[PDB]
Write a protein that binds this ligand. Structure first.
Ligand SMILES: Oc1ccc(/C=C/c2cc(O)cc(O)c2)cc1
Ligand SMILES: Oc1ccc(/C=C/c2cc(O)cc(O)c2)cc1
Ligand code: NA
Ligand code: NA
Lengths: 116, 113, 113, 116
């Protein structure tokens, strides 16, 4: 799988477990088409969203449902979600790790892009 | 003005100047309606986007054109843009700050008196 | 004043108020000599730490007392403090910003005219 | 090993490879005693710094040599190093991951603390 999402909690110093993630891909008509979804594991990781074959060139949006995560812990957070929008595989196939570090009123995201 | 946007560059240690910023408000049909826009100043700040009267409760999106910023410096960036999506709640000043790198960004909200 | 420190709270979305900040300068014997200190204001800022005359080239450390800040909110934090260590170079205004969470912090430098 | 250090590069979107790391522990006389050191691998990770037996209660400092890392890539960075100072194992043994995300004029650090 060439796409992995990793989420960390900066309040608890832990993986962010059971975080919903929705991935969208921009269609030829400029709409966001559902691409894949899942939720983070006990390690804060979400593996197996897609395959090398399915993960073609395109503009992708990874939506991390931060608000639902914080509400479940009794915190009323600032953001609706964290959205990561990027062009993928435009110089051929790459592996992407999208990491997010969450606080109630802030988040940080980074990408690690590797060439198999 | 109850909304200010501040953009910083983590590579050069400077304000991010002349960055396009677009603000949208979510409509009843779940589409994003253009609300306000501008370019960051020499201080990396964008003031005067809206008024207390116009800035009613609702879901807003701040889109920062990070890709054009990095391309203008000759740096190949990861993201198409940085998006900050939040609910304005009357329960009164919002500063949306973003700290930019080519493959990463950090955003915070400073919500005060 | 060529040095300003700004501290923000990522949990509450607010300035970090009444945070102790200590600045040190590295001496010839590699020890840290006290240089300036204060507490962040209601805006999370600490101004007037030094002067252009005093703030000569050298290695400085800004120590932010994050542990006392979180303990005062009833939150158990990870770090003893946040330390920012940098060289001042005359080749002229330095803002050291820190964004605090209980188990994390982000720091940036904004170095301008 | 109950201590792992992970370093990421926010300019290149990659692990930060060959980053020197020095760990110190506060002695009874309030000095920083050398505890362990090493450098990040091709994955940006540094494993095997210590053992459960050796990693006793104490105040530890993890110094990440960011300046040497950036200078090696032709960037003149702002910070001398990134220092992470924390009390460890004061409620019994824990596993600590210290992560740092680096830019020339900025860094972010977080801890992931797990109970074996
Ligand atoms: O990770 C980070 C994300 C955001 C920030 C904000 C810093 C900052 C600095 C200023 O001088 C004014 C301001 O309104 C904000 C810092 C770090
Ligand atoms: O501001 C930030 C600070 C730290 C991080 C960490 C990301 C990360 C990604 C991994 O694959 C493993 C890991 O241990 C950590 C992300 C953002
Ligand atoms: Na191509
Ligand atoms: Na104890």
């Amino acid at each position: 799988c060439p796409l992995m999402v990793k989420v960390l909690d900066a309040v608890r110093g832990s993986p962010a477990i059971n975080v919903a993630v929705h991935v969208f891909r921009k269609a030829a008509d400029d709409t966001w088409e559902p691409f894949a979804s899942g939720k983070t594991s006990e390690s804060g990781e979400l593996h197996g969203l897609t395959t090398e074959e399915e993960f073609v060139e395109g503009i992708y949006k990874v939506e991390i449902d931060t608000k639902s995560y914080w509400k479940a812990l009794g915190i009323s957070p600032f953001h609706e979600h964290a959205e990561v929008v990027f062009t993928a595989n435009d110089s051929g196939p790459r592996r992407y790790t999208i990491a997010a570090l969450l606080s109630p009123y802030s988040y940080s995201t980074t990408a690690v892009v590797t060439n198999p």
